[PDB]
């Protein structure tokens, strides 16, 4: 298990409020972060907008728009996910 530092960025009006999640890897961390930012009703996934694969970067959540038959839509604004070593 690893720890990741989450900055919700525009999701909290760039207030500077940040928090951590625990996850096995960065993509799992980004999904957990999206669930925390967007609330219990969010079910979806995330894709990467910045950074190297398996490394820190900006992520964007998306989901299937309920009531429709096809196609994804983004949810929320991008947020940052960073590996964090705890002591």
CA-wise closest residue to 35 among 14, 68, 59: 59
Strand locations in the chain (E): 2-7, 19-23, 45-48, 57-64, 72-84
* Distant-in-sequence contacts of 46-51, Cβ < 8 A, 24+ apart: 49/78
CA 17 to CA 20: how far, in whole Å?
A: 11
**Three-class secondary structure of residue 40 per DSSP:** coil
Going by their DSSP bridges, the two strands 72-84 and 2-7 should be labelled as: antiparallel
Per the entry, the structure determination technique was X-ray
Cα distances (angstroms) measured from residue 77 to each of 1, 3, 21, 85: 26, 22, 18, 26
Give the start-to-end residue ranges of the domains of the chain: 2-84
CA 39 to CA 27: how far, in whole Å?
A: 18
């Amino acid at each position: 298990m690893n720890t990741y530092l989450i900055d919700p960025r525009k999701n909290n009006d760039n207030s500077g409020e940040r928090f951590t999640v625990d996850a096995v890897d960065i993509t799992a961390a980004a999904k957990s972060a999206a669930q925390q930012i967007l609330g219990e009703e969010f079910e979806g996934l995330v894709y990467r907008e910045t950074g190297e694969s398996n490394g820190s970067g900006m992520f964007q959540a998306y989901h299937h728009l309920h009531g429709t038959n096809r196609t994804e839509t983004t949810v929320g604004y991008p947020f940052h996910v960073m590996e964090l070593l705890e002591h």
